Design a protein around this ligand. Structure first.
Ligand SMILES: [Mg+2]
Ligand SMILES: [Mg+2]
Ligand SMILES: [Mg+2]
Ligand SMILES: [Mg+2]
Ligand SMILES: [Mg+2]
Ligand SMILES: [Mg+2]
Ligand SMILES: [Mg+2]
Ligand SMILES: [Mg+2]
Ligand SMILES: [Mg+2]
Ligand SMILES: [Mg+2]
Ligand SMILES: [Mg+2]
Ligand SMILES: [Mg+2]
Ligand SMILES: [Zn+2]
Lengths: 140, 193, 77, 135, 136, 39, 64, 103
RNA sequence: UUCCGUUAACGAACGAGACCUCAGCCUGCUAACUAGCUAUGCGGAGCCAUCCCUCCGCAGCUAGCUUCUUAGAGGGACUAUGGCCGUUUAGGCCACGGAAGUUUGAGGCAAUAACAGGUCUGUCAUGCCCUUAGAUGUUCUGGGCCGCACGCGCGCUACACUGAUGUAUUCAACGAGUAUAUAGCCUUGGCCGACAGGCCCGGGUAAUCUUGGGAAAUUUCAUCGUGAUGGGGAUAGAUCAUUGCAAUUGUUGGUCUUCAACGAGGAAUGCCUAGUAAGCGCGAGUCAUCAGCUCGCGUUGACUACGUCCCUGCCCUUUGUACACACCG
């Protein structure tokens, strides 16, 4: 009865990973994750995958989809949604205690894999272009 | 300890050993926690004080790389330059290029400086000591400025300018902008001692 | 140096980088980038980036090309 | 297949593909133009027209209903206006058109009901197998 | 490989530097921009990866031909820089010193005609409707 | 050839949404037309 | 030949300077753990930091 | 027999709109209609920025107005005689109702 | 002037805080074919092919569908727990936990007394005064506000290689769209066109059509190789087109050509403490056409600092005053 659909979120980039209990497929938008294309930030999207190992993926297919945001925002949503779909799937279908090792490895590496970042772009105030800047001021 | 984590999956952090027990706190190279695969992270640093002594040394330098306006706001180019530099450090010395980075950060840090103190009612400058965290701050800033003005209007590229400066600084020679400015700040403070 | 104006002064297309110079320019560290010796062999580029297209098929070194066209070097193996 | 491969080498394979897989017609202004108003020089590529075709071929591969104007829009770019601030400028459309009539006369694509250009069932075959023949 | 490498060429008496692409060396000629240089090199059918100076004399001759009879190459009326002239009306690519000549032609026309544009040139201040309090 | 519905002045109109008022008449009748100023 | 000595910032006595730029601290020598000497440091410092100290004699005085 | 009718409803006030829609909805449930809604539609936020000075000096200070318009729809599977059997009850202030006969 | 408290004071009013909005969290609730997964059915293409496995398109009495999207009602955070400091008061610093521990962020509103602050050039708001036909009224034609020895202010573009040009690759949010007449504001698709821009059949009064906004910067592949160079794009010549009844003192946009000064900038000076500066484009106002501006929106995204009264000021207390239009006395 395995079926999860778990997400992750960044500035505006929202990423949703829906899973089957297949064998080894992990794609992004139909394209393999092996090709994610900030091609220096191709380590980041793999970080959950390499922290856990494929052995924790030999029974799942992740057709993860990402919409909105920017570019690095999307990388940072994919990381989050892979991590959060993994922990949701283990917690509901492997075991709570067996999921504990996964969360403690991830939160050991960092905490931002699993928990979204509350930071957003804050509105710009009249009297100067900039959220916190102002026009240059002249006295004479 | 357990460290199957190599930045860019080729450059092993294990066997990293900083002589300065002063900066063993302020360099993020030793304990299991500061290791990351890539010097780019969406960190919520700067929210609280001293939080940056925990930022990875390579990421923290990468942040110092993206400077002078045309180059503010592009960390991807910065990590790219770090990779090319970081490769060619190995491609010259055949030792842990991380050791080269960290030993250069150590060796390019002033130990005494001159502030503008006054006492008992009158002010005129006096020399003081350097807290190790601003030691490290200024080493990062000053190595990076050395590389940048070595690369300005020069066909030679930034990755390799920065590699040249890290290699000869961690060597300890007085061929780096970084160590030259270090030594002059130190001798001015020694003057105003 | 004047290293693409000079691309045609026939010593370059005769012996200069026909393992006369960058047989030894590697020898310092045995693996010393073309881009990095753009100034250790002070000579600049595109008479130097053509020669490494030359010397890969002249079969004398290993190569990495990436973002900045950032090419590299290795002496003999 | 096509999604399974690096987004560049597919275009590098396919550019030589519709060079050597037979041939076709090609209007006799291909060599002068800038292909977009904001550009500055004609493309450095000698076989730039085929790479144009390959890229637009995978655009139509993985989307339906892309127009004469949508192809302009997806190929436009940044226009530095001189001392003025730069902006977005759409590319030129008559370059995209004859690419579409080439792929149409090759049957790689064809005009869509509801508007646009949709991949042809056999053009799908062509692109999928040429992508399968990549590392 | 420059067995006979010529460092300055004297093409059309403008001192083409012999160390640049035939592409971006003809730009020195007054009337040959980057674009018209590129199209001249194409329609003279020349190997482009070639420093002008390693290039041969037949090729210099063809460059001559394509720039003194361009319209015969089907090259459109709209690269040329004297479109719909009013002396004659022919479409021409005016050349190194002919450009100076033609510029003086237009200016003297306007000077005689008493144009606002022409007297504006004759006074020296800016000619294109521009504010002039704070610039020029 | 366009003035306020209010004061018949041809400077500083707000033509968007068809207000056809000047920027000052719109502030003067602002909150009763319904531009409740949460911010 | 003065050899640099390391000391630990046991407690920060204050933040002195005309402009408020210098922290004024107590350093406890690692080498002989009974030498508490009081110094001026520049930059952010918190308790327990090991500090590189070129000269030993130069000390601050309370509100220097 | 039983046709397909839609009710298009919008206003300026959250509370008042939420009261009207619930009135229609419970009206539908009393007569056991095949009712589907009330689907909520994204709120259109008219905005204006105006320099709040009337003469133009001092610090350049603007004020922003915003009218929010809230869009709602309900689908009813009924005959229009039943529709006017129902939708004659009190309509609360400010809310606007524009029933439409669909395909 | 927030409180504890002291207390010739007692008790009260505004201001602060409270209040409102946007943003951050919820796999909890109400729903949603104008939004959208998910599964199945077929349909295309690849493939140990015969079935399957993968990417795609189409429709549904598929949902014991609502994660994604929208927006309603709620919930949540209070420094609650712990530690140390504290009259163990008001509180403060630290630590787990949590999305959130500068009041969580940002704004909106914002007191008495004023200033001879700005506006009669916003008003059929307005006293007094001037004008009232040969008019400072109103209308029309043209010029003018735009004229340039020169000084100043906010900005735009750059001085390159951490780059320029040329392919390829692909990701937002704000918002906006009058009968606009014989398709008409936003404009899809098709054709003509190198470009500008044209002709055709359309869609939308809008989560329906534009636009699920295919934005740039950035990302790879080459090309330039330190050179006032292909950086830089002012200046001007020639021509076409669109808007407009009308483009001249070039409306604007193209094409080709001209390739100007600018080598990181003197004394001095501006803003800025985290999605912030900086970099990047987009929308809106203005608009028949003109956005280097102003107001909003997102994208990439940091150095330093967590302090002080040194400078420039504000608040309170003591203090001195020959000042009170108040030290610009
Ligand atoms: Mg460089
Ligand atoms: Mg607040
Ligand atoms: Mg004026
Ligand atoms: Mg201003
Ligand atoms: Mg580019
Ligand atoms: Mg240029
Ligand atoms: Mg100031
Ligand atoms: Mg506009
Ligand atoms: Mg006295
Ligand atoms: Mg006295
Ligand atoms: Mg007096
Ligand atoms: Mg005085
Ligand atoms: Zn008005």
């Amino acid at each position: 009865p395995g079926t999860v659909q778990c997400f992750g979120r960044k500035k505006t980039a929202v990423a949703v990973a829906y899973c089957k209990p297949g064998r080894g497929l992990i794609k992004v938008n139909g394209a393999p994750i092996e090709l994610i294309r900030p091609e220096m930030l191709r380590l980041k999207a793999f970080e959950p995958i390499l922290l856990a190992g494929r052995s924790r993926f030999k029974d799942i297919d992740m057709r993860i989809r990402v919409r909105g945001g920017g570019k690095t925002s999307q990388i940072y949503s994919i990381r989050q949604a892979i991590a959060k779909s993994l922990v949701a799937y283990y917690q509901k279908y492997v075991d709570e205690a067996a999921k504990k090792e996964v969360k403690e490895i991830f939160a050991r590496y960092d905490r931002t894999l699993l928990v979204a970042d509350p930071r957003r772009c804050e509105p710009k105030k009249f009297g100067g272009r900039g959220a916190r800047a102002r026009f240059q001021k002249s006295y004479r | 300890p357990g460290g199957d984590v190599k930045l860019f999956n080729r450059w092993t952090f294990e066997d990293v050993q900083v002589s300065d027990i002063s900066l063993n706190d302020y360099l993020a190279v030793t304990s299991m926690k500061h290791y990351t695969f890539l010097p780019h992270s969406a960190g919520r640093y700067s929210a609280k004080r001293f939080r940056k002594a925990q930022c990875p040394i390579i990421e923290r330098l990468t942040n110092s790389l993206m400077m002078h306006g045309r180059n503010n706001g592009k960390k991807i180019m910065a990590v790219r330059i770090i990779k090319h530099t970081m490769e060619i450090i190995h491609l010259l010395t055949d030792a842990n290029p991380i050791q080269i980075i960290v030993d250069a950060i150590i060796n390019s840090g002033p130990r005494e400086d001159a502030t503008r103190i006054g006492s008992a009612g009158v002010v005129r400058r006096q020399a003081v000591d350097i807290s190790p965290l601003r030691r490290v701050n200024q080493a990062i800033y000053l190595l990076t400025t050395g590389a940048r003005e070595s690369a300005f209007r020069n066909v030679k590229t930034i990755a390799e300018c920065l590699a040249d400066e890290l290699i000869n600084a961690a060597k300890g020679s007085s061929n780096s902008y970084a160590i030259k400015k270090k030594d002059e700040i130190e001798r001015v403070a020694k003057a105003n001692r | 140096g004047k290293q693409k104006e000079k691309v045609n002064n026939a010593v370059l297309f005769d012996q200069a980088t026909y393992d006369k110079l960058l047989t030894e320019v590697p020898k310092y560290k045995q693996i010393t980038p073309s881009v990095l010796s753009e100034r250790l062999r002070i000579n600049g580029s595109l008479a130097r980036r053509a020669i490494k297209d030359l010397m890969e098929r002249g079969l004398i070194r290993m190569v990495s090309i990436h973002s900045s066209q950032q090419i590299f070097t290795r002496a003999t193996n | 297949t096509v999604k399974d491969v690096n987004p560049h080498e597919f275009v590098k394979a396919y550019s030589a593909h519709l060079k050597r897989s037979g041939k076709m017609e090609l209007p006799e202004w291909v060599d002068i133009v800038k292909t977009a108003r904001f550009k500055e020089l004609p493309p450095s590529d000698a076989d730039w027209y085929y790479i144009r075709a390959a890229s637009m071929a995978r655009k139509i591969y993985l989307r339906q209903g892309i127009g004469i104007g949508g192809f302009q829009k997806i190929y436009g770019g940044r226009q530095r206006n001189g001392s003025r601030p730069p902006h977005f400028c759409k590319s030129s459309g008559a370059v995209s058109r004859n690419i579409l009539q080439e792929l149409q006369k090759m049957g790689i694509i064809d005009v869509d009901p509801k508007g646009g250009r949709l991949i042809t069932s056999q053009g799908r075959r062509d692109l999928d197998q040429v992508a399968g023949t990549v590392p | 490989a420059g067995e006979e490498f010529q460092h300055i060429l004297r093409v059309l008496n403008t001192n083409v530097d012999g160390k640049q692409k035939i592409m971006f060396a003809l730009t020195s000629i007054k009337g040959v921009g980057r674009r018209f240089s590129n199209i001249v090199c194409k329609k003279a059918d020349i190997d482009m990866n070639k420093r002008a100076g390693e290039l041969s004399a037949e090729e210099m001759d063809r460059l001559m031909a394509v720039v003194h009879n361009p319209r015969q190459f089907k090259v459109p009326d709209w690269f040329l820089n004297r479109k719909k002239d009013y002396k004659d009306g022919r479409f021409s690519q005016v050349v190194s010193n002919a450009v100076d000549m033609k510029l003086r032609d237009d200016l003297e026309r306007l000077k005689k005609i008493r144009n606002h544009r022409g007297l504006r040139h004759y006074w020296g201040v800016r000619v294109r409707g521009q504010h002039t309090k704070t610039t020029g | 050839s366009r003035v306020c519905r209010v004061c018949g002045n041809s400077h500083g109109l707000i033509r968007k949404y068809g207000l056809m008022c000047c920027r000052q008449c719109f502030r003067s009748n602002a909150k009763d037309i319904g531009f409740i100023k949460y911010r | 030949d003065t050899q640099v000595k390391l000391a630990v910032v046991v407690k920060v006595m204050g933040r002195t300077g005309s402009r408020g730029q210098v922290t004024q601290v107590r350093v406890k020598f690692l080498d002989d753990q009974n030498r508490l000497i009081m110094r001026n440091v520049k930059g952010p410092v918190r308790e327990g930091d090991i500090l590189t100290l070129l000269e030993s004699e130069r000390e601050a005085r309370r509100l220097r | 027999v039983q046709h397909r009718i839609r009710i298009t409803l919008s206003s300026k006030s959250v509370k008042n709109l939420e009261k009207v829609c619930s009135d229609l909805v419970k009206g539908a449930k009393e007569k056991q209609l095949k009712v589907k809604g009330p689907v909520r539609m994204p709120t259109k936020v008219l905005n204006i920025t105006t320099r709040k000075s009337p003469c133009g000096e001092g610090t350049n200070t603007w004020d922003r107005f915003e009218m929010r318009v809230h869009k709602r729809v309900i689908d009813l599977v009924s005959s229009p005689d039943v529709v006017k059997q129902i939708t004659s009850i009190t309509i609360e202030p400010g809310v606007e109702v524009e029933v439409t006969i669909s395909d």
